RNA sequence: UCUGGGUCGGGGUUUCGUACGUAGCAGAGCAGCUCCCUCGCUGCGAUCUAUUGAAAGUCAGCCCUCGACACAAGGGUUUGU
RNA sequence: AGAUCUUGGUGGUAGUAGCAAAUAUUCAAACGAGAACUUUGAAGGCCGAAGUGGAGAAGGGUUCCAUGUGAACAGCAGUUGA
């Protein structure tokens, strides 16, 4: 239903921002049950939460 | 059925079209439209503008 | 109608048929064709169907 | 193992975005 | 039939002309949905996200002039809805729009 | 209706000004490769030339199509000397 | 019956003025009776390190954090909330 808590916890576990947290839209219900950082940790290992890569800011044009 | 004129771009100007420019030096030009006129006023060379007659004849 | 402005015979010399959808500069299609010659659209027209 | 039916649907799940986004690595269930 | 699918091209430029900058792209999606409601007769029109990406590909004000879509009147025998049929509209990539008709497409 | 009107496509007009790519013993030159060549070829290089009045837009309140496609004898509210 | 009387209540105005400072939203899905506003994902944007970022002092005082509700409040709405 609502994943405001899980996005906040996943950010803290991944040591990234909420910008870079990817909660799988297919497994909304599975993520919704994870109400603790330990269940979040297993979600990240299993692949239901992915830390997205940094937005590209290339310096090739400057180089 | 009047005199038939030719522009800065070499195009044929039918009566009732375009403008006429008489400089102080005594020479008179006729233009077909403000595109051709402002090209001439900014001293652009018609031999380097591709759609101009003098370019087509040159190349 | 008694003034000389009226009862004056009209004798036309020329009727403008240039394009009014912009700054038209050609009276007819045929005048435009003779001035510009064949174009790319007409080249492939004479090339695809021969 | 991979067959044609498995491959054609695998292309969908690994794509989680448009051009220029990282591909999905895995989706593993474990109880 | 009534599960038909067809391939159209839409002059977005014609339907957008006159809309302000900050509303051109949103209007293009309201015009695309309004288009499908006309050529398919359905009120339920689902717009594919890859089509929404193409509409927003060049930003909010520099909308593409022409788009190639594919209307698909599928069946909504999935839940209790007033509309028994919906039109899913997708995005067809094309390199040229010259001599492109509205073609019926088989399944 | 002896159909109609739409959406595309095509043609016309028109706007700007000659697209991408490819080719050139074109190009200020520069950096390499010479058993070599007896006068050369390999790269980088704004730009120039041809392809190319080309490319792109063009009614949304421009003109004409008869080409493609689907759609249109359907809905609701009322009205009597 | 009056005191620009006191207190309380109610009208027209009037479904009117107005809900116009700081560029901007869109598609799909989920839960849900109900989605312009909630959540997720995909886009397009903004702040642009003298920030719309991360932390404190004063001041607040429990607003913090979970779960639940949808009466009233959040000048539209809300499945959301200080
Ligand atoms: Mg005019
Ligand atoms: Mg047209
Ligand atoms: Mg009294
Ligand atoms: Mg009083
Ligand atoms: Mg008002
Ligand atoms: Mg207002
Ligand atoms: Mg900025
Ligand atoms: Mg701060
Ligand atoms: Mg809170
Ligand atoms: Mg309210």
E11: three-class secondary structure by DSSP: strand
**For ion ligand 1, residues whose CB falls within 5 Å:** C 20
Q: Please indicate whether, in this complex, the C-beta atoms of A52 and D22 are within 8 angstroms of each other.
A: yes
Structure tokens at D2: 């991979």
DSSP code per residue over A1-63: ---HHHHHHHHHHHTS-GGGEEE-STTHHHHHT--SHHHHHHHHHHTSEEEPPPPP---TTT-
Name the residue in chain B with its Cα closest to that of C37: B56
Q: Please indicate whether, in this complex, the C-beta atoms of D25 and A53 are within 8 angstroms of each other.
A: no
Angstrom distance (rounded) from CA D10 to CA D8: 6
Angstrom distance (rounded) from CA E93 to CA E107: 18
Give the pairing of strands E85-91 and B28-31: unpaired
Structure tokens at E75: 């069946």
- The residues of D between 2 and 31 with beta carbon within 7 Å of nucleic strand G are 16-18, 20-21
Residues 6+ apart with CB under 8 A from A56: D20
Identify how the structure was determined: cryo-EM
Give the pairing of strands A49-51 and E66-75: unpaired
Angstrom distance (rounded) from CA A51 to CA A44: 8
E21: three-class secondary structure by DSSP: helix
Rounded to the nearest whole angstrom, what is the distance from the C-alpha of residue A2 to the centroid of ligand 8?
A: 27
Structure tokens at E46: 């689902």
Angstrom distance (rounded) from CA E83 to CA E33: 16
Structure tokens at E41: 């007769």
């Amino acid at each position: 239903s609502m994943l405001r808590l899980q996005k906040r916890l996943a950010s803290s576990v991944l040591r990234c921002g909420k910008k870079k947290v990817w909660l799988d839209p297919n497994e909304t219900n599975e993520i919704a049950n994870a109400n603790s950082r330990q269940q979040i940790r297993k979600l990240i290992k299993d692949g239901l939460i992915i830390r997205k890569p940094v937005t590209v800011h290339s310096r090739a044009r400057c180089r | 059925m009047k005199v038939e004129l030719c522009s800065f771009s070499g195009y044929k100007i039918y009566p009732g079209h375009g403008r006429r420019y008489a400089r102080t030096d005594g020479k008179v030009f006729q233009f077909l439209n403000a595109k051709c006129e402002s090209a001439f006023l900014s001293k652009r060379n018609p031999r380097q503008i591709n759609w101009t007659v003098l370019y087509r004849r040159k190349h | 109608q008694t003034k000389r402005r009226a009862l004056e015979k009209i004798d036309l010399k020329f009727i403008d048929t240039t394009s009014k959808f912009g700054h038209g500069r050609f009276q007819t299609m045929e005048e435009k064709k003779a001035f510009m010659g064949p174009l790319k659209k007409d080249r492939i027209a004479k090339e695809e169907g021969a | 193992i991979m067959n044609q039916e498995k491959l054609a649907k695998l292309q969908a799940q690994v794509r989680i975005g448009g051009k220029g986004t990282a591909r999905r690595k895995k989706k593993v269930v474990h109880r | 039939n009534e599960v038909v699918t067809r391939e159209y091209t839409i002059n977005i430029h014609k339907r957008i002309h006159g809309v302000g900058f900050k509303k051109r792209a949103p209007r293009a999606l309201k015009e695309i949905r309004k288009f499908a409601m006309k050529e398919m007769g359905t009120p339920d029109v689902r717009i594919d996200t890859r089509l929404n990406k193409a509409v927003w590909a060049k930003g909010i004000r520099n909308v593409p002039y022409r788009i190639r879509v594919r209307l698909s009147r599928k069946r909504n025998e999935d839940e209790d809805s007033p509309n028994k049929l919906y039109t899913l509209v997708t995005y067809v990539p094309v390199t040229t729009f010259k001599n492109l008709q509205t073609v019926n497409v088989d399944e």
